[PDB]
Design a protein around this nucleic acid. Structure first.
Ligand SMILES: [Mg+2]
Ligand SMILES: [Zn+2]
Ligand SMILES: [Zn+2]
Ligand SMILES: [Zn+2]
Lengths: 133, 168, 49, 43, 159, 114, 141, 263, 559, 65, 85, 196
RNA sequence: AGAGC
DNA sequence: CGATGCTC
């Protein structure tokens, strides 16, 4: 809107599978013992070590041709240190209650498992990923 | 299971899925009658030969046998609803798309098929490397292949180099 | 730097290309094909040097 | 020129093939590609 | 040999089997041997398949052989092309070769046959029996410098 | 034999004009300038300078074929800003920088021995 | 003085040849992994030894740098092309009145040579130039 | 002085080693290009052969004559013939040279660029004098003559730029390096074991601080410091190769600025 | 054969070919001199009169000009001579033999013409220099390279003749070929190599470069796509910018080895609405593959759009790569110290296995299986051991090649080379063969006079233990030369044999065509097939599809 | 066939350097590599120019006319 | 005679590519030879591009004589034939 | 061509400034494609280059003789001694931008040969000209301004395409075509041509 | 005849 | 009675 999903995740693994700028992160939420996250992060501009505590936010707004940031007086939903824009591609249900959402950030893949995704994560070319601390 | 057939059904489905903005959350507006009787009509409407007589009627029925086998396996009630999640709008469009694409797939009277067939075999034959096959390792695998064999076949060579029986 | 070995015929430089032939006065035996009534054949191509 | 002056021709079982006996006598490499291949040799 | 066989539960399952590979051919006699599967018996000698099993079985075995040559190279050619070639060799009731002995002897046009091989002699026997050339052939129209009944020339255009 | 004269790289042939301003059809406040008898020396330099301007939204150049000198420069500016003005400032900015460099080298050169 | 001898393919059949002088006949009792692998001795009843195994080659092949590091048909392809290469066929080119003559303005002796080139007078009458070459994907031209 | 900065490391009659700081890469490169291609010099563009009993061909000699470097100090006070209102060539647009050589001695006679004689009226400007950097003062061996050989020809030297023909190049090789520590990550080193061990260290590493092992990637950073070595053929002095390079580029940018006024 | 079936013709041209990354798929680069030679007879109509008069004024030496003006009498006016050459005032109904101009359809050809695709109509593009220039993706149907090859150009002389070329023979129409019911043209060489490199997860591009790449696509909508990254700096991924070349409404799904919708290895392929979701773009996607991006694009958007797709992909990739660079040196053949040690010993145990089987054979303990000689079974074993050795040593080498290894990079892209190449260059060349057997005893009981009699050892019978990097020994060299010679003889034989086969095939089927009753008949009207290919479908309009009822378990079918 | 005036790759004048090179080799008794470096031919493109030069003109001047 | 009437016509109601190519060619030849155009030109000058429009707007007055292998024929107008492709 | 069965034509020519460059200011005279290397397995080409580079740097002749103990490692050790990376790789900068190339280039000298048969010696074009006496068909040869062969194989491709009119045109309008008078009775070319 | 893919 | 296509 505003926000669509928010949580603080605990980093399980950090793997650079034959890459030097990218790492695939494995995580689970600190709150929900069922919620999981699998995400490719650009460790060159945002390094993530093992056992870290990162705030993952999924938004939908802060369309047409892209304009360079232009410091001027420009302000977006950024109070974070890592922002990404991508598209939703698969919404598979993993047993009765549990469901998973698939996002691609220009080929940087994201898989989020849980149940409370509900009236939020929809079939959109839109979706912004915001990570802080 | 994988065989060259006209009309890529999978691609038509994917096209309806994006065009009509399909959502795996809202129930479809289809009917068992809409699906079952729909695909049955699509079949009754696939043309290759347009004659209204028994011989041609049966000839036409035969040509579409394998394509209808594909059509039914891909457009069954369960799949249309559970897999594809199509609407009546997206379904009627898929049906009309197949029919048109099929008629486009048909060979045109005039096609010089003879030269086409000859060149289609003749060109890859030119690209064949070594008369000495990959079976040259073991002695009980030595059968004349490549250009020598292709020559034995085409000339209908009465006395072939490797005459063999394969007993099951 | 010229090496010679060639001729000059009507102003044109000619090379006599070395010609490969089977040597004469050699005895050589050969097996003959399946239909043939002669099993093997011994041959000499007797030439006067 | 040197090469032309050291050429061989074979008119007419397996003449085109590089034979073991060619060792130190005829060049294993230098032969024309196609038709003349194996019949035109170099010392 | 490896064989894809349907399992009692439906799925196709690899079931390896004993197969005999032979040097030499006598199909007629071998097929009657007890213990074999006369339904499955195969020969690379498509002529033998033709003589024993018929022209239709000959055709199948002929394509099987042409297919194998293309496939052994790793190449793929669509069925219809080889299908046509095989059918052509087959339509006359026997195995018609793709040489001057097979297709060039056929009931086709005198000018269309002399374009391949036996050029002069094909035209001589044509002038002996006093042959009437249809001119419905590609080669003859090519010789005559006329629009052949090929694609564009198959139909006529009128006002 | 079919070789064009080497002067055709840096010399305008009767009819050809240096700049050709074509208004872009795809985007608003966007223009396409065709530079005749010029290359990577001017194309890159101007394009890289236009990027330093905050009111410039888009700036890209291309040499469609090596055989010919002509390059294409696409400029998209913010509403109110004429892309032609952006090109002007980009050029003036370059000359000022070049002027400075000339003097700076001359000053350094005159301090040197050998 | 009978230190060297002439052998034909018929006599070749009755003799045992060593490939290298030293390396093929000294003694027996670590190595360089960069160097190629060799079969040692086993047969030690030599009657002759090869003057130099690079002498198995002739004129065109003798021009090739390291043919022993090349796929065999490339050595054959090169041999055919060397004859299409222009240089200085003779010093008297300005004096001969011949049908077609192609002379390189600045012939250059190759930086990479063969010991056999000394006898083929290649460094004295070359047929190419030592071009500074980049193996690269540049404009895709 | 304002924008870009210069710092000379080495300076001779033939070379200039300098650090070009506070510049954009696009500028440093456009400058490198213009020094190679767009500075006008004077070179022989026409050879009229009267006599050639030499071992070499007319056009072979003619080609070498164009490569001989000639004084191009006062090249701006000479017109491009294409702009000159004369019929063909004159003193406002060209310099005329004569080469007359005859092998008198039994021994081999050598023909040098020192032997070209200016016949044209130079009108007091420093132009067309064959550039001699040779210890013996001969400079460039045009050709060799036998017992009684002869070479008699006339050369018309004209204004031009390397873009038309490489003979008009005032510059030889321009050494050009930036970011000697690959801190910008502008290149990805090919290695077997260790890039650091396998790649030889650049001389310009002394002029920059090492990246320091325990530091994250500087993404925002851009190349602003360039290590260059402009080498002069001789036609124009080194300082001038650079100055005229800056000037030529300045002129073509001003040319475009003026073209906008014409519309 | 030489005068009726074929003959020498007018309005023909021939030269050396060259590749052009800046030419369109359906275009052909024509040297201005050739364009000036070859003419088209254009009738004077009010539609063209203005252009034609100007062309007549330009004359035979300026390019958009002409030579010859034919009047209502049939008399040609030679524009290069004639006093009235600069005087001519055109009349309607008169023909003007104008020079060949941009966008004229011409028939391009490369001999041998084994295909309908060896002759394709191209759009003229009059260019400087002496070679015919062509798009790199048109290379394969022609079976052309640029090592000295020459091609033929034919100019239609009639309005209906130029219609035939544009509506039937045109390059875009030939993309999906009826031969193998797949495309016959794809992304090759630099473009294929670069596209993999550009398309990696590590590959990120910055604004300045992005905008340049964006502008390179001519069709570009002018919309800057939002970067995949909006953290400390906007960073666009390689896949993102390449997706700009892909049209909208394009859907493609694949699945390779471990492809799992979360594609850990960046394998397989997923393209939605022409946006590449995941997977590295290589030969399977962008090549002349059966289910590829090319086959799909032609079927979905059409030939004219697909032809344009080649240009757009080429333009971005070639540009990105020009600024990235790609090379190959002796370093890419060098395998690690420890790797060589394994390779060396892998060959040592192979040499031992051979000695053991030899010793067994010699002891008369070795027993041959039914159908083969003790020696036939021995030779079979030794060769098996020796091939295993080369394959094992090669795999040992390939494994050691880093992702940065240029040869590996080319293999991975599918642009050039295979396993064998890596194996033979860096690990071991392997066993040599003549007549399918290892080096024969040319001399009495020996391969060479350097060996003793009755020596069956790998080394003795042509086993090249060394790699091309290490270098071959004189014995190895000569033996490899014997293998090579056999290859060349075979090449010369195969080229001739297949030529005669092709002519026979063509002559035997010339007259077979689909009649107006869907039947396949000859010149006599004799039926060959009642329905063409048994379905009456055109081969280019067909593709491999899964029949979902045939496979799976009984329970899985039911579910 | 005379030292090329200028190196093909870079353009550095090399035509004035042949006689000097020959005297460095003969008279000074120096080796090629040090001789080339003493002439100030630093880059390998300039080195291959002279080092690889075959002076066929001397053989050509031997012909009587 | 021989012929086939308008009713009982068993051939394809769709136009073949070969039919299209000949149709466009023959009409382009006519347009190129100053024959009248049955469509409103919109800056069009190319005889082929015009014929393509005359086909698009079904104003090509030509008939295809489809010969069957017995010799018999079927006359189909450009106006009635379906131009899908 | 190089000395390794590596034949190729000039695709384009670039001036010094558009060419990629060494930080020393060295630039190639030639640019060959990496793709010409893997399948051809012409490792000697690569070894020659490495050796020739060390040779040009040291002022000695490179011993590229066959059966010797000279190794790539041996060359490599000497090349690094000259201050270059042992495997012939060199950092290059893009001529157009000045920016360093992401990939390093295998750069060094290599002996190349200028081969006979050049474009200008091959370019042919004919739009009607001399006709042969007997056949009344175009002549055979560039020198004599001859017609290019539209052989029977070429004829086949046009049949396969279904271009009936182009085929008629190639065999008539271009090349041959002649008007003869035929008898309605005997059907022979015996009709006496008394025109006007 | 001789030569290039 | 066949015997790759092209070319000076
Ligand atoms: Mg080729
Ligand atoms: Zn003047
Ligand atoms: Zn140099
Ligand atoms: Zn009569």
């Amino acid at each position: 809107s505003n926000t669509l999903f928010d949580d603080i995740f605990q980093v399980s693994e950090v793997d650079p599978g034959r890459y030097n700028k990218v790492c695939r992160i494995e995580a689970a939420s600190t709150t929900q013992d069922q919620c999981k996250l699998t995400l490719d992060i650009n460790v060159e501009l945002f390094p993530v070590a093992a056992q870290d505590s990162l705030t993952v936010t999924i938004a939908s707004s802060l369309t047409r041709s892209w304009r360079p940031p232009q410091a001027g007086d420009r302000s977006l939903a950024d109070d974070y240190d890592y922002v990404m824009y991508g598209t939703a591609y698969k919404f598979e249900e993993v047993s009765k209650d549990l469901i998973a959402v698939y996002y691609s950030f220009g080929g940087l893949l994201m898989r989020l498992e849980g149940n409370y995704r509900n009236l939020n994560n929809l079939k959109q070319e839109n979706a912004y990923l915001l990570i802080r601390r | 299971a994988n065989w060259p057939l006209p009309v890529n059904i999978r691609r038509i489905i994917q096209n309806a899925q994006q065009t009509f903005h399909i959502d795996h959350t809202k129930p479809s507006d289809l009917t068992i009658k809409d699906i079952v009787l729909g695909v049955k009509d699509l079949q009754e409407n696939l043309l290759v030969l347009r004659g209204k007589n028994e011989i041609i009627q049966n000839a036409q029925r035969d040509a579409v046998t394998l394509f209808c086998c594909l059509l039914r396996s891909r457009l069954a009630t369960r799949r249309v609803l559970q897999e594809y999640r199509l609407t009546k709008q997206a379904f009627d469009w898929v049906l009309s798309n197949i029919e048109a694409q099929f008629l486009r797939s048909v060979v045109h009277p005039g096609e010089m098929v003879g030269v086409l067939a000859a060149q289609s075999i003749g060109e890859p034959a030119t690209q064949m490397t070594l008369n000495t096959f990959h079976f040259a390792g073991v002695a009980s695998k030595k059968v004349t292949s490549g250009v020598p064999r292709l020559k034995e076949i085409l000339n209908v060579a009465k006395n072939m180099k490797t005459p063999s029986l394969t007993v099951y | 730097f010229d090496m010679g070995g060639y001729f000059i015929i009507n102003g044109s430089e000619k090379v006599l290309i070395a010609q490969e032939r089977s040597a004469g006065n050699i005895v050589q035996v050969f097996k003959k094909a399946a239909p043939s009534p002669i099993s093997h054949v011994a041959e000499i191509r007797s030439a006067l040097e | 020129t040197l090469s032309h002056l050291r050429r061989t021709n074979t008119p007419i079982a397996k003449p085109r093939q590089l034979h073991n006996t060619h060792w130190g006598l005829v060049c294993p490499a230098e032969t024309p590609e196609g038709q003349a291949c194996g019949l035109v040799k170099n010392l | 040999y490896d064989r894809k066989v349907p399992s009692p539960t439906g799925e196709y399952v690899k079931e390896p089997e004993w197969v005999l590979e032979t040097d030499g051919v006598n199909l007629s006699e071998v097929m009657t041997v007890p213990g074999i599967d006369p339904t499955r018996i195969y020969t690379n000698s498509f002529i033998d398949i033709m003589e024993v099993l018929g022209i239709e079985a000959g055709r199948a075995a002929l394509y099987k052989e042409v297919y194998n040559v293309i496939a052994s190279d790793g190449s793929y050619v669509n069925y219809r092309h080889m299908a046509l070639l095989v059918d052509v060799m087959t339509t006359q009731g026997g195995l018609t070769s793709v040489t001057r002995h097979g297709f060039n002897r056929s009931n086709t046009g005198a000018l269309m046959r002399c374009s391949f091989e036996e050029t002069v002699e094909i035209l001589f026997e044509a002038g002996a029996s006093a042959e009437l050339d249809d001119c419905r052939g590609v080669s003859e129209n090519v010789i005559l410098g006329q629009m052949a009944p090929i694609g564009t020339g198959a139909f006529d255009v009128m006002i | 034999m079919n070789a064009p004269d080497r002067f055709e790289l840096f010399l305008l042939g009767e009819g050809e004009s240096k700049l050709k301003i074509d208004p872009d059809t795809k985007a608003p406040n966007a223009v396409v300038i065709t530079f005749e008898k010029e290359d990577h020396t001017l194309g890159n330099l101007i394009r890289a300078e236009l990027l330093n301007d905050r009111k410039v939204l888009f700036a890209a150049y291309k040499v469609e074929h090596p055989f010919f000198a002509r390059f294409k420069l696409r400029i998209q500016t913010t509403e109110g800003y004429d892309p032609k003005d952006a090109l002007k400032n980009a050029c003036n900015s370059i000359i000022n920088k070049l002027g400075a460099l000339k003097t700076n080298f001359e000053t350094e050169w005159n301090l040197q021995t050998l | 003085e009978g230190l060297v001898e002439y052998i034909d393919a018929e006599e070749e059949e009755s003799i045992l040849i060593a490939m290298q002088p030293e390396d093929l006949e000294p003694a027996e009792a670590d190595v360089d992994p960069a160097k190629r692998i060799r079969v040692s001795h086993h047969a030690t009843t030599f009657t002759h030894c090869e003057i130099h195994p690079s002498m198995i080659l002739g004129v065109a092949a003798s021009i090739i740098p390291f043919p022993d590091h090349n796929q065999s048909p490339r050595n054959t392809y090169q041999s055919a092309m060397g004859k299409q290469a222009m240089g200085v066929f003779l010093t008297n080119y300005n004096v001969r009145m011949d049908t077609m003559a192609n002379i390189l303005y600045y012939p250059q002796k190759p930086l990479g040579t063969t010991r056999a080139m000394e006898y083929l007078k290649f460094r004295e009458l070359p047929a190419g130039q030592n071009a500074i070459v980049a193996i690269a994907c540049y404009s895709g031209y | 002085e304002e924008g870009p900065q210069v710092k000379i490391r080495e300076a001779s009659k033939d070379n200039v080693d300098f650090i070009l700081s506070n510049v954009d890469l696009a500028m440093a490169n456009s400058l490198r290009r213009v020094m190679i291609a767009e500075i006008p010099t004077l070179a022989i563009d026409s050879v009229e052969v009267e006599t050639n009993t030499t071992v070499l061909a007319d056009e072979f000699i003619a080609h070498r004559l164009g490569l001989i470097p000639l004084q191009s100090m006062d090249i701006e006070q000479l017109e491009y013939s294409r702009d000159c209102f004369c019929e063909d060539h004159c003193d406002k647009c060209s310099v005329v040279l004569t080469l007359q050589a005859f092998g008198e001695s039994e021994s081999t006679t050598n023909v040098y660029s020192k032997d070209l004689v200016i016949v044209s009226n130079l009108m007091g400007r420093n132009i067309g004098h064959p550039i001699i950097q040779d210890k013996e003062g001969n400079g460039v061996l045009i050709c060799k003559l036998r017992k009684g050989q002869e070479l008699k020809l006339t050369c018309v030297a004209k204004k031009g730029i390397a873009k038309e023909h490489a003979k008009w190049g005032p510059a030889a090789a321009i050494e050009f390096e930036y970011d000697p520590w690959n801190k910008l990550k502008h290149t990805d080193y090919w290695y077997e074991q260790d890039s650091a061990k396998e790649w030889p260290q650049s001389k310009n590493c002394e002029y920059e601080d090492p990246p320091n092992e325990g530091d994250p990637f500087d993404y925002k950073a851009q190349a602003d410091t360039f290590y260059m070595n402009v080498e002069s053929v001789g036609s124009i002095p080194v300082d001038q190769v650079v100055v005229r390079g800056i000037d030529t580029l300045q002129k073509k940018v001003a040319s475009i600025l003026l073209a906008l006024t014409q519309m | 054969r030489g005068n009726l079936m074929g003959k020498r013709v007018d309005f023909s041209a021939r030269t050396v070919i060259s590749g052009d990354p800046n030419l369109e798929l359906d275009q052909v680069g024509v040297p201005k001199s050739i364009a000036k030679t070859l003419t088209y007879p254009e009738v004077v109509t009010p539609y063209n009169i203005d252009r034609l008069t100007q062309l007549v004024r330009n004359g035979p030496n300026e390019h958009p000009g002409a030579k010859y003006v034919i009047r209502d009498s049939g008399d040609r006016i030679d524009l290069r001579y004639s006093k009235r050459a600069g005087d001519i005032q055109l009349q309607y109904g008169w023909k003007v033999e104008r020079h060949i101009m941009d966008n004229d359809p011409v028939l391009f050809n490369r001999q041998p013409s084994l295909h309908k695709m060896s002759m394709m109509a191209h759009r003229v593009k009059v260019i400087p220099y002496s070679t015919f220039r062509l798009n790199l993706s048109v290379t394969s149907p022609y079976n052309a390279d640029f090592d000295g090859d020459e091609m033929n150009l034919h100019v239609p002389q009639s309005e209906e003749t130029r219609a035939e070329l544009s509506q039937l023979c045109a390059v875009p129409l030939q993309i999906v070929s009826p031969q193998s019911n797949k495309p016959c043209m794809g992304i090759v060489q630099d473009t294929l190599c670069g596209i993999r490199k550009l398309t990696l997860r590590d590959t990120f591009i910055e604004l300045d470069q992005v905008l340049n790449m964006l502008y390179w696509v001519p069709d570009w909508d002018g919309v800057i796509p939002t970067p995949a990254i909006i953290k400390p700096k906007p960073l666009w991924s390689g896949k993102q910018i390449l997706s700009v070349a892909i049209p909208n409404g394009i859907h493609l799904q694949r699945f390779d080895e471990g492809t799992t919708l979360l594609s850990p290895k960046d394998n397989g392929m997923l393209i939605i609405d022409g946006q590449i979701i995941f997977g590295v773009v290589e030969k399977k996607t962008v090549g002349s593959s059966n289910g590829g991006l090319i086959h799909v694009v032609t079927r979905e958007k059409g030939p004219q759009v697909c032809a344009k797709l080649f240009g757009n992909i080429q333009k971005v990739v070639n540009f990105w790569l020009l600024h990235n660079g790609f090379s190959t040196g002796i370093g890419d053949t060098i395998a690690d110290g420890p790797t060589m040690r394994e390779i060396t010993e892998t060959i040592a145990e192979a040499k031992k296995k051979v000695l053991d089987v030899t010793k067994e054979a010699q002891a008369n303990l070795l027993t041959a299986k039914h159908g083969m000689t003790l020696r036939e079974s021995f030779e079979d074993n030794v060769v098996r051991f020796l091939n295993e050795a080369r394959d094992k040593a090669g795999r040992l080498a390939e494994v050691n090649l880093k992702d940065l290894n240029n040869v590996k990079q080319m293999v991975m892209a599918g642009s050039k080379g295979s396993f064998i190449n890596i194996a033979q260059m860096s690990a071991c060349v392997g066993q040599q063969s003549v007549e399918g057997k290892r080096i024969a005893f040319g001399f009495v009981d020996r391969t060479l006079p350097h060996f003793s009699k009755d020596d069956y050892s790998p080394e003795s019978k042509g086993f090249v233990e060394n790699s091309y990097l290490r270098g071959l020994t004189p014995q190895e060299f000569f033996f490899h030369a014997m293998g090579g010679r056999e290859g060349l003889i075979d090449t010369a034989v195969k080229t001739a044999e297949t030529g005669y086969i092709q002519r026979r095939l063509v002559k035997a089927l010339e007259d077979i065509m689909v009649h107006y009753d869907n039947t396949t008949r000859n010149s006599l009207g004799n039926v060959i097939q009642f329905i063409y290919g048994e379905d009456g479908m055109d081969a280019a309009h067909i593709e491999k599809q899964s029949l979902d009822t045939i496979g799976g378990s009984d329970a899985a079918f039911e579910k | 066939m005379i030292v090329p005036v200028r190196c093909f790759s870079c353009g550095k004048v090399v035509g004035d350097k042949w006689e000097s090179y020959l005297n460095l080799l003969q008279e000074d008794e120096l080796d090629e590599g040090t001789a080339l470096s003493r002439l100030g031919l630093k880059r390998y493109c300039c080195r291959r120019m002279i080092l690889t030069h075959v002076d066929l003109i001397e053989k050509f001047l031997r012909y009587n006319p | 005679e021989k012929a086939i009437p308008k009713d009982q016509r068993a051939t394809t109601p769709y136009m073949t590519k070969y039919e299209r190519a000949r149709i466009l060619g023959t009409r382009a030849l006519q347009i190129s030879m100053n024959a009248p155009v049955f469509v409103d030109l919109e800056g069009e000058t190319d005889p082929l591009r015009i014929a393509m429009k005359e086909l698009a707007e079904k104003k090509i007055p030509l008939v295809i004589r489809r010969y069957l292998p017995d010799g018999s024929f079927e006359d189909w107008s450009v106006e009635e034939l379906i131009v899908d492709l | 061509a190089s000395r390794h069965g590596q034949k190729g034509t000039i695709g384009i020519t670039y001036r010094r400034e558009d060419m990629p460059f060494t930080a020393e200011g060295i630039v190639p005279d030639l640019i060959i494609n990496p793709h010409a290397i893997p399948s051809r397995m012409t490792v000697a080409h690569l070894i020659e280059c490495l050796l020739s580079k060390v040779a040009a740097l040291s002022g000695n002749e490179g011993d590229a003789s066959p059966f010797t103990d000279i190794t790539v490692e041996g060359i490599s050790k000497l090349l690094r001694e000259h201050g270059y990376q042992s495997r012939g790789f060199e950092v290059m900068y893009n001529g157009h931008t000045g920016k360093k190339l992401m990939a390093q280039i295998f750069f060094g000298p290599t002996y190349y040969q200028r081969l006979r048969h050049m474009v200008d010696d091959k370019i042919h074009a004919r739009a009607r000209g001399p006709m042969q006496v007997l056949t009344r068909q175009p002549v055979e040869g560039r020198s004599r301004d001859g017609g290019l062969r539209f052989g029977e194989m070429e004829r086949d491709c046009m049949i396969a395409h279904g271009a009936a009119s182009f085929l008629k045109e190639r065999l008539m309008e271009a090349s041959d075509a002649f008007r003869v008078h035929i008898c309605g009775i005997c059907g022979l070319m015996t009709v006496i041509a008394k025109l006007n």
